[PDB]
Each structure stands twice: as structure tokens, then as C-alpha cells.
Nucleic acid binder design. Structure first.
Lengths: 317, 317, 316, 314, 317
DNA sequence: AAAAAAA
DNA sequence: AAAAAAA
DNA sequence: AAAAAAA
DNA sequence: AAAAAAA
DNA sequence: AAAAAAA
């Protein structure tokens, strides 16, 4: 009924949070995913210290974390997430020991341990996807101070190293910048800043985002873009009968990933660094378009020239 | 009559300097505040050596400071500040011992000790505010050799770690740069380079700067801006009858909130550095205006396009 | 009937894949050539470890490869390639031993060994040519994430060291970059990025690509150019009667290896990047033309100003 | 009569060169200052090798220097400088021992040693000021092969580490580049590439350069600028009656040091990287020359001082 | 009659080639100089192997060179050069042993060895000057494939390491690139791409190139410029009576070396990255002139805006 | 917009 | 433009 | 355009 | 456009 | 758009 990743995530969240884990609230799912990600990276209190090559300051911080008592049952997480009494058992059972690697487990040959490690990897990937989607959802109506120029915005989201490792194609930030600056191997994944990510309530259920879905404007925009994206993407939504809060999806943007506008010299031609700019691109900027695929077909929509955050702020005035 | 902070500062300065501390001279007040900050930071000769995690060079420097004789009574400070014979008693009484922390004092429960620690913290904050104002006043006519570009000027004033700790929102420099670069938590405070600070002769009295105050051009500018702020802010001053040296404040600037107008490249659209300017192509910056709020109302004044330091230098030729 | 190289490749592919090796599918031929190149480079499981100067990590990887079981008969390769039970015999026989060099064999003087070494070199050259063509065919619709600027795009295709060594005149990548950075000896060869390469279904048969051949648009473009070449090259193709999928070639590009028109700064003058453009100063890059040779004659076609990849994406 | 620094320099030059040291020749004074600087930094032959943390190559070079015989009396220095037989005594006495530090001397408490160290420091400062002046004078007519772009020209003069330490505000080069690139403390000084330096024949006498003094065009330009400075500065010089070789100073440049044209963004304004650019023909600019009558703005010539000096001689 | 350098080169060439060495042919002199350079760098077959720090591949190559038989007397060199039976004696006697350094020879105190090393250095310098001149002469009628852009053309000629070491102010290539990129000591010498090099038939004789000399167009151009220099330089040549092939030099270019067009910011002025480009009015490049000094006087000749190679190619068609 | 590596 | 944390 | 630190 | 260093 | 060397 469900793939391995989604089933593992559902089981883990249900076990850790019991019945307090609502299965239809984006905020609840994002908070639960963040907590599970912290648990599975040994970021919670009372777990193994990360000291393999840590600096003395990092060693002190990890020692303080280890000394600190672990979270207790009944503790409130986020807004409406309450820990059960069994969460310690789950953390002890399903969490790989610090430093564990897939090669070591494979050498061991224990099928149960291999399955547990696969479940842990899938859970990390799912939680990082949910974390990226929540970062986009927050950034629609809350500017990040660190993002002041195009260069600063070029690496959104800014997530920890574990997030980058779990999903290098979606997660940006310092680690993505480091990977791009350094040597690029055959495994290099470029940052698909505007990759389509289903809403968490859809991601856990496995329902792929598509036309006809009943989704709020903010969550749809967080799914297909973020705050500093061109406002024209708002055209991918249409309020339902009686306005309300939930509308419908009318289409999806095209060219979401893989946009390269280079032309190399050949056969006596001249190299071009940008197809769009060549000629007089400054006057053609606001004349650009985006291809939106709808149920009927593809349509080109003129760019609004205004940030998504600014459009949402203005329409909310 | 006066808040706790100003009263504590007045008592401390009176005790240390007696009658030699003028209550109407900005330079004297700034020198006294700097000396008091040094005393409460254990930066004077003969005070506790900082060795908790000091490097061998730092350990040697602190040992040299400790071995050196402490300042004697009657020692000249700055220009017109003379230490009183009772300054040693005040230093011994009102200066918490090195390493003092509010948590430990609260655990002790001594009401007198808690009040003393609160007074010390208030004195630190007041002294740091006076230090920042004096840095602005100095930079109006005497640039800093460490400021060469906009990136360097983004961290003015350049003050020590203690000043940044006391007033993180007003004090820039190396520590502000470090804080901005690293992780930003809920307690992170952005550097307000041009935060309003009344002159020290007003700050100790608590008289908030407002329209109609009889202040000098340079001191007003240091109150609202610094050397590299655009010269248009000079419109906030007006010479009084007969010119002279003291005029009157006609208005104050308004700090605009944070609002980024970027539009990153997405789905084939070209990046926009600024939505407002890209469309019509009005790239000229000299047209920009500042909102000066006056007694009559708010007025948009066109920028001069020249640094405040340059304007002051040219008008003083 | 066929040259030595194509005959060697045909015999090798027939022996290794038997009847499962289709002779008219470009994807199948490309996969077979890739597998043969892997086999003759001792990169498969169970072959000699490359340790002559390997680093400890490289030594570990090669030891892991050697310890691993060799591919078994009937194993599925690519999509429609199945290994025959006699592939092990060919691998043992026709594959030169690791570290073998032509000088050593010539000193030995065994005519059969010399012929085997020559056949192996020809097989490497043919396999690498097919690999380069397949790289071009892939790049027409799926950009390489390692290409983001013109500097990086200058070194396409990005192939391994073996590919560069076998065919230095077609293969780019890190090794070609290193060769360019270092000394340029008399044996140095520049990367002819857009060198015409017949499709594998043509290369193995020896049928040189020319006008009138019934070839698909994508395969023709992969033959004469790659993803980031200008879209104007699409003019070399023309749909046949009834459209369908297979058309015909109407012309081929004329490789413009013209002499440099630079004038370096000297005696206080100013450097000129191009003496021709200096006069009129027509700074419009959309006016350039490419000389396509057709059956009737050569014609100058105006550049489209858009990447071949973008034109293909829009037309699809 | 004279400050400590100039008196110390005059005494040292008299002791080391006797009467052969001409007090009115810029080249001779510069060469004598360079020799004294080499002596007081322990660079001449026969002085202690520098090995504290030297690399094997540096250790070998300094061992070679130590083994090599010390300079002999009567040796020709520069062009018209001859060593005296007593120079060895001065080198042994007034030169601090290698590694001497003012803190150590102060801890010792010997007044004579403290005075000697102060004299050594003043001599180093004076010698490096003269060295920078001479570097400017040379660069007027003989370009440096190391200066090819404005980025390279930004660090003139290129002088040894001892020169940078003696006067970090004037000297440039690799050490100034390192100081600028790295962390800058409260002691940081920016490279004042056109700070006014009196000519050596004036510097040792202590006569501050001012309008009316009889100086040569080349030496005045060296005092106020160098080769790659905009040629308009030549307006500061006026030939005397009958041309000849010596003229007079009419005016001096202003804003020599401390020119910043930034405007940081504030109160919603936009940051301006350059006030001049936001106003843009470069050749229209002017430089403020202060004369006896008053300040006058002279239009920039747009041509490097070296080019103008070369063309005026052809 | 002749300086030490030219006398040494003449003696060495006569000893190694005897009467087969023509004293008026540029190709023959260039070939002889190249062969002597190969001999004096221990690059010929059967000479000392360079193994001090050579890589294993380099060690193999040098071992192969050492094992190979040395050149035999009577071998044909170039076109019209034949080795003499006494060349082995000269190679053994006048060639310093591999690794010989001037410091070691001076320490030994042997006057004869010091003189031999001086002769070796002078011969290296002369051979490298001739090699650079021949490189220019080749580039006039044969483009170098390695030169495709202005940056590539900036380092011509591309000569080996020994050539760069002997004459660093005339020889470019990888080693000049390395010297420019790395630290620049006081001894640093820039690459004078258009220095005046007398033709080999004049360089060995010591006759400095001057006005009125009977030199062919191609060899004059190779003397004063190279393939990708401005075509205007052809004005420095004039066919003699009856045309023929040999003409006469009517003038020489000025500003051959040491051309800097920088003005630095000082006293509030603005930095000029290039005086020519910044010149008042948009100076069209084809309007630029070169100063040719002639017997009568200097004349400004307008640039032809076309390469010397292309001018020669068109004039020969 | 599958899996295997992996401050 | 209040307090509590805290090179 | 004073003193104290100090490849 | 002299001499000494010295992939 | 023939062969020989050969991270």
C-alpha cells in the first residue's frame, strides 16, 4: 500500500508520539519530522557525543549534551505533540549506534541490522525533505536576514550538514556551497532550489502533487517555490467555491529543474553566456514568461516581476 | 526621579571622580564611562588576571597587568578627570569578582549581591552606549584606518568583545562579524549601526533626544548617524539665532524595516536585483529620499550623495 | 569487406554477446561497446587489480574488485544484451594481460601476440569513439550537472582516463584539461569537440556519415554536435515523407578552423581580439552564420542563438 | 637645536663616514642611510647570523654572511662614500646586539642601554623614511617591472620587512599586503602612498618642506608623489629665474592621506561605493593645491607623472 | 674585436661544425645555436641523466637518453650542418659537468674552470637569444596552434626551462607564467615580448641592428616583432632598388619595452586602469599610432589593425 | 520529480 | 528608540 | 604631515 | 636594447 | 573526418 520509506516514517512517528501525532496538519508533521531527525542524528540530550574529530569547544558542547538528561515522557514538543512513555525504547531500538556505516553492517551480515540501517536512511531522507518543505513554507511570509543579495539567496535553504548529506539535491547552504566550490565528481548533484516537493500531509501518504489537489495557496507555493521566487507562480492556484481557505491546483510550472542557457562556439559561431540576455535583455526582463502545464495544456504566463513573499504580503494587506 | 541605570552610573562616577567629573561635558562623561567600563571589566593594573582559558601570550599579558601597580589617587584621567582617594574603595565594593555570574549569585540568594550584580550590568550597558556614541562622534571627523570598503564599514564601530556582549545590537566589529557569520538563534540581535543614542550629557540625565534640543551639529550627527552616513542627515540640524556653536534639532530620521525585493532566477526567469528599479531602468541612486520626521510632519528629503565626513570637512574649510 | 578495426569489433561483440547483440540499434551497440571497453581495461569484477602505483584507497578498491565474483554467463547487460557462456574464453584469450605494452610484445616477436595487441588497440579506439557519440546523444536531452559555465562546457565529453588515452582527439574531461595545461609536444592533439562521428549502427558497418542517409534528428545532432552547440545545426536535418521518426540528412557543417585574426598589444598600441570585427564593430552575436555543405552547394545559415538542447526541449 | 632622531642620525653618519658624507647631496645621504640601515639590521658581512626560526636555505645564507669577512676601512660605498677606520667601533658599540628588545632593556634598568636602544629605533625610522623617499625618486623615471596593474601599483614602495616595521604607515610591499589581508588590530596603519616626506637634504636638517623652498622638480615630486601619480601634481613646481636646474615650490597637495568616498546605506538609502563616480568623465576631476594665496583646484592631467617627466625631457 | 660572448659562440660553432658552418645564413646559424644549446643542457643522447629529483617517468626517459648512443661524426644536422670528428672532444671539455654551479667553481678557486663556466653561461645566453629570434621568424609565417586568444598570445615564445633561465626578459611560456603568478622578488624580470633582437647573422658578428642595414622584410620583422604584432610595423622596411628580396631598414619602433599606462588614485583623483582607453573621447582603436624613429626624425604611423602574419600572407598572394 | 557510495 | 540567558 | 608595543 | 645570484 | 610511442 505504501513504499518502505513512507511506511517506516509512519511507524516511527506513531510509535514515538502515539495518538498525539495528527496525520493531516502540516505543522504537526513538520515538527514531528524535525524531532525524529534530531533523534536519528543523536542531536537530542543524553545521546552519544560526537568527538571523533571534534574541536575542544565542540567536545565541550557534545559532553554537555551527553551529560544533560534525555527528554522525559510527556514532554511537550512543538505545539500539539506529546512524547509517550515508550519513546526511549524506540530510540534505543531503531537508532543506529553513533558512527555506524552501511559497509560495516553489510560485513556483519545481520539481516535485521541491515534492514534497520535502510529504515534509518529512508527516515533521514523523508525528514530532510519535510524540513526543506517547512523551510520554504516559513520563508513565504518570513524573510531570512542572511538572505540579502542574489548570491545569498542562491543557496537556500540553509540546513545542517546531516540535511545536506541526506538530500544533496534539495538542501543547499554552506555544505552545498562547499561542494560546488570544490572538485566536482561523477556523483555531484546541483542544488535544485525550486524542485517540487509534495506537502508533508501528501508526502507521508505518498500522494504525488498534481493538478486537481485541494491545497492552500501558501502550501502550494512552498511546494513549487519559495519566498524570493517570481510572483507569477501564484497563477498555479485558484480559490475554490466560496473562497474559504482551501482552493485547487490549476497547473504546475515547467523547467523547474535543469535550466542551462549556454551556447558553445562551433563551426565558426561565437560562444554565448546566456540565451535570454543576448541582444538587449534588460528591456526583455519583464517580458519573460514561464511555462505552466495545466489540464488543458501548456501555457506561457508573463512574469510578474515581484517576489512571492511580496505578492503574498500585498494581497494580505 | 531617575532609572536604576542612570542613578547607578551617576553614583559610581561621583564616587570615583568626586567633583572633578563635569556633568555637562560630553568628552568628560565619555572618558569617565570608558574608565568605569575598564574597571568593571578588570582591565586595569593590579586587577584579577584573566587565565581561565587564556593563551600563554594572554597569560603573560594578564600577569604583567596584575603585577603592575594599580592606579593611584590623584592620577590624571583623560583631560579633566582626577581620581579620588576613595576610588579604591568603590572598586573593591561595587566591582563583582572576576568570573562572577548572575546564576551563581541568585543561587547564593544574597539580595545585596544580586542588586550589586544588576547595578554592574546596568553600568556596563550605559558605559557601552556612551562608548558607541563617542565612537560615532570620533568617526565624524577622524576616519578609521580599518574601514576601506563597504564591507568593512558594515561592522563599525570596531569595539572589543565586552562592548559587543553588553550591547550586541549597537556594537559591531570582529565579534559582531563572527556572530552574524555563525548560527543565528532566537537571541541573535542584528547590528543597528545607526540606532538612536542621545549624547552622554543627555544619556546620564535620561533626557531622550527630541526635536528642539539645543545640540551641536557634530554631536547630533553622532547621535543619529556617523561619518560614512549620507550627508543629507545634516538637514536634521539648524543653527540658532546668531549662529554660534549650539543650534537646534529640527527633525529625526525614521528607520525603515527589513524588506528584501529580490527575485531569484526560477523556471527560466532572469534574476532581478531590485523589483522597484529593474522595470523602468532608473538606475540612478541620487534620487533616493530619507523620511525626516519633524514637528510639523514627515518630509522626504533628497539624498546628498556625499559622505557625512566629507560634508563636514568641506563646510569647515 | 571491412577494415581490421570494425572486423575486430564485430567478431568480439558476436563472441561476447552472440545473437543477443542487435546490429541495428544504437543503444544496444553503445552498451556493448561500453562493456567491451570495460573488459579490455580490466575494470570488471575478477580481473587483475591495478596496483602498480595505486594509492591505499585505490588498492582497497582494486582488491574489492578482484575478490568479487566475475560476471556469470547469461547475465543481463543494459536492456537487450545477454552474456553468452563463451564470453569467459574470449576474455581470457583476446584481452592482453595487465601491464602489457607494445614494445614488450615486439621484443618478444610473437606475430600472434602482436596481432592480438593491435586488435586490442583498434577495439579500444572503436569503443571510445562509440562512447563519445553516446555521450553526445545523452547530452542532447539531459544536461550534465557538472556543466554550468562555458569553461566547464569547453571540456565535454567528460570521460575517464582510458577513453582519453584511446582517442585523445575526441575525448575531453579532466585528462584532456591536464594535457592542455601542461606541455604541448609534437604528439599533442586538441579536443575536436564537434568532430563528426557516424552513429554506432554506421560506425561498425564502416558506412561514413554523409548526405542522404536516413538518420533520426537526435542521432544526427549527436553525430555532428552536442547539447550546448547552437541550434542552427538542426537545419542539417529534414523530415522525410509522412514525417514519422526517420528523416534524411540535407547537409553537413563545414568545420571552420580558420586562422587567428588577433593583433597583440605592441609599442603602445591596444590589443585587438579580432581584426575583422574591429572595423564595423557589429556587436550582435545573432548575425553569425554557419557554412553548411549540401548536395547543391554550400550555404550560410544564420545562427538561431539558442542551445540545441533548448531547441529540442521546446520542439518536444 | 635638533630632535633626538636627526641628531642621532647625524652623529652616526659622521662616525661611520667622517668627512666623506656630503650633507647637501640627496643621493649621498640616501646611500649613507641605506648603509646605516643595513648595519643596524645586521645585514652587512661579518654580523650575527639570523637563525632564530630561519629555514635551512636562510640558515645557509646567514652562515655565509657570518663567515664572510666584514667590510674593510676605506671601502667605497655607493658613489662618493668612503668608510672610516673607526666605523668598526661604532658598529660594535651603538648597534644593539641581535635579538635585543626594549622590554628586556627596560627590565635590565640600564639608562645607557635604554638610550642606545632609543637611538637605534630613531635611526631605523629616519633611515627607512629616507629609503622610501629614494624609492619614490627612482620610480619617477624608471618604472618597476613588478608594477603592471593598479592592483600591483597599490602597494608601492616594495621594501624589506625591517623597512615596514620601522615605518608601517609609509612603506608597502609584501608586508603591507600581509597586514592588510590579515586581521587588523587597533594598531593597524593604512599604507599612506603619498604622505609628504621631506627630501633627505631637508629631512636630516629637520626643515619641514613648505612653499618657497628651492627644490628640483624630480625631488619635489618624490616628496609629494611618485611616478604613477597623476601628472597634474607637477603644477606644484615653478622654475626659478633663468630656468637652470633648481626652481621653487609654489603649492602643496591636499587630502594627501585620509580620503574615503564611501556612503553606507542608512535610513532606507542606498550604499554608494564612490561619491565621485555618482556625479562621470574622470579627466574632469581636480586636485586641491594649497598655495600661499589660497587653495586652488587644478584639473587633473590624466597622464602618469612618469609619462609627463619622460615627455618633458624629449 | 669581439666581446667574450660572441667570440665564445664563434669558437664553439667552428669547433663543433668546422667549415660546414655558414656565417651569413640565418637558418644555419639558428640550427647551430639550437644544437649547441642541446649539447650544453645535457639533452643530447648519451649525456648525463637528470635524476636529482626527477619523477620515475622522467628517470626512465633520462635513462633511455643516457643508454642511447651519442651522435656520430659526420651526422647531418638541420639542412647544411655536418658534425666534425672533433665534436666529442669539445663536448667533453667545454661542457661543465651536470650540476656544476658557479658558487662551487668559485670556491674551488680554479681560474680555468671559472672561465669555462663563464663561457658556458655566455653561450647559453647567445643561443637563447638566437632561439627566440628563430621562434619569432617562424611565427611570422606559421601560426602556433597553442595561441588562440590574447591570453595565450601574452606568453610567446613558448620555450623550455633552460631558455627561460638563460634569458628571462625575452623568453615566455610556462615558466614565465609561473614567475608572474608566484612571488615577485627584486630580481623579477618581465617578458619583453617585442624586444629588439639583431638577426643571427648580425648577432654573432656583434653588429647592433640600426637604420640602413640590408635586411629582408621577414627577418627585420622577426627582429622587431612577431607574427601577431600590428601590421603597421611593416612601415619600418623599404625595398631596395630593383625590388629583389633584400631591402633596407628606414626606422625602428619606439616604446619597444617598459610601456605602462597606469595612473593611480591620489589626492582624491580616480584610478585609471588604462590611459589609452580612458583618453579623452572614445579613441577608436584603429586611430592609434606607433612612433617610428627614423634617421630624419620620429613619425607617428597609424596602426593598420591587422596582424603581421596576415599582412605578409595577403601581400604574398 | 530506484538503488549503491558518503566549519 | 523591560527583563531574563551569556580572537 | 609624540610616546608606548612588535616570506 | 655590464656584472653577480639561480612542471 | 594510416601508423608508430603512451587524480
Amino acid at each position: 500500500e505504501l513504499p518502505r520509506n513512507l511506511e517506516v516514517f509512519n511507524e516511527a512517528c506513531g510509535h514515538v508520539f502515539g495518538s498525539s501525532f495528527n496525520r493531516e496538519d502540516n505543522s504537526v508533521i513538520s515538527d514531528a519530522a524535525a524531532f525524529l531527525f534530531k533523534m536519528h542524528t543523536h542531536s537530542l540530550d543524553g545521546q552519544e557525543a560526537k568527538v571523533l574529530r571534534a574541536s575542544e569547544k565542540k567536545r565541550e558542547r557534545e559532553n554537555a549534551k551527553k551529560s544533560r538528561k534525555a527528554p522525559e515522557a510527556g514532554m511537550r514538543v512543538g505545539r500539539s505533540l506529546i512524547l509517550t512513555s515508550r519513546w526511549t525504547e524506540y530510540c534505543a531500538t531503531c537508532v543506529p549506534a553513533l558512527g555506524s556505516k552501511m559497509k560495516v553492517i553489510k560485513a556483519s551480515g545481520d539481516a535485521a541490522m541491515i534492514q534497520m540501517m535502510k529504515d534509518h536512511n529512508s527516515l533521514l531522507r523523508v525528514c530532510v525533505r519535510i524540513e526543506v518543505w517547512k523551510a520554504r513554507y516559513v520563508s513565504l511570509v518570513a524573510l531570512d536576514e542572511r538572505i540579502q543579495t542574489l548570491e545569498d539567496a542562491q543557496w537556500f535553504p540553509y540546513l545542517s550538514g546531516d540535511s545536506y548529506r541526506a538530500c544533496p539535491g534539495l538542501v543547499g547552504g554552506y555544505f552545498a556551497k562547499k561542494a560546488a566550490a570544490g572538485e566536482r565528481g561523477k556523483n555531484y548533484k546541483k542544488l535544485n532550489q525550486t524542485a517540487i516537493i509534495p506537502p508533508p500531509r501528501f508526502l507521508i501518504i505518498g500522494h504525488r502533487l498534481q493538478i486537481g489537489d485541494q491545497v492552500t495557496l501558501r502550501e502550494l507555493l512552498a511546494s513549487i517555490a519559495w519566498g524570493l521566487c517570481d510572483g507569477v507562480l501564484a497563477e498555479c492556484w485558484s480559490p475554490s467555491q466560496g473562497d474559504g481557505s482551501i482552493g485547487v491546483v490549476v497547473g504546475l510550472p515547467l523547467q523547474a529543474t535543469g535550466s542551462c542557457f549556454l551556447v558553445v562556439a562551433s563551426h565558426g559561431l561565437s560562444a554565448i553566456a546566456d540565451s535570454r540576455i543576448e541582444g538587449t535583455g534588460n528591456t526583455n526582463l519583464l517580458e519573460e514568461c514561464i511555462a505552466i502545464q495545466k489540464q488543458d495544456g501548456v501555457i506561457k504566463c508573463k512574469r510578474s516581476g515581484k517576489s512571492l513573499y511580496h505578492c503574498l504580503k500585498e494581497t494580505a494587506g
